[PDB]
Paper text:
The DUF1471 family includes several hundred members, all occurring exclusively in the Enterobacteriaceae, such as Escherichia, Salmonella, Yersinia, and Shigella, among others. Many of the basic features of sequences in the family of conserved proteins from Enterobacteriaceae now known as DUF1471 (PF07338, alternatively, the YhcN or BhsA/McbA family) were recognized soon after release of the first E. coli genome sequence. These proteins are characteristically small, single domain proteins of around 90 residues; though one subfamily has three repeated DUF1471 domains. Most DUF1471 sequences contain apparent signal sequences that target them to the periplasm. The fold features a three-stranded antiparallel β-sheet with another, shorter N-terminal β-strand parallel to strand 3, so that the strands are ordered 2-4-3-1 across the sheet, with strands 1 and 3 parallel.
SssB (STM1478, also known as YdgH) is another Salmonella DUF1471 paralogue implicated in pathogenesis. SssB and its homologues contain three DUF1471 domains (I, II, and III). The structure of the C-terminal domain (III) of SssB was determined by X-ray crystallography by the Midwest Center for Structural Genomics (MCSG); target ID APC101565. Protein crystals diffracting to resolution suitable for structure determination were only obtained in case of the fragment 244–314 corresponding to the SssB-III DUF1471 domain, and for this reason the solution state structure of SssB-I was solved by NMR spectroscopy. Despite the fact that the crystals were pseudo-merohedrally twinned, the SssB-III structure was determined by single-wavelength anomalous diffraction. The final atomic model refined to 1.45 Å resolution and contained two molecules (A and B) in the asymmetric unit. The molecule A of SssB-III structure comprises residues Lys 247 to Glu 301 and Asn 305 to Lys 314 whereas molecule B comprises residues Lys 247 to Lys 314. The SssB C-terminal domain (SssB-III) adopts a dimeric form in the X-ray structure. However, the relative arrangement of monomers and the dimer interface are different from those of SrfN, and likely represent a crystallization artifact. In the SssB-III X-ray structure, residues in loop 2 and in the neighboring transition (loop 1) from strand 2 into the long helix exhibited particularly high B-factors and are likely to be locally flexible in solution.
Author numbering:
A (entry chain A): 247 to 301, 305 to 314
B (entry chain B): 247 to 314
Amino acid sequence: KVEELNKATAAMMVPFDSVKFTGNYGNMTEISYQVAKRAAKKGAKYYHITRQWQENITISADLYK
Amino acid sequence: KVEELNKATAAMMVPFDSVKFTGNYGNMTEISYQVAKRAAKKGAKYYHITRQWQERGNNITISADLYK
Ligand SMILES: [Cl-]
């Protein structure tokens, strides 16, 4: 129920917070799950991932009501 | 159809090729679709993402190993 917006949708909206974290994830479904979990913890209904870095991976996503 | 593998599954398999490209991210669903399409064009049944860089929140550079 906590879903990722595409950039065109997110661009029209105002985020209330963001999440930023690092970890070792099996695939893109797992990355999305990890973001969604942190998003849901913060009361977001949606998110949009804004950064993905190599180093494990580091991910940053904006959160939306 | 073409399926994404997780790390442990891919680790036991041997890829035959990879895809590497840069394009519009959109969201994970949309980028996964782009990877799957390129995998399908090369004859793969599975892929595993090996690298990803999204550093300025527009484009993403990705690579993926391909498997039969
Ligand atoms: Cl795994």
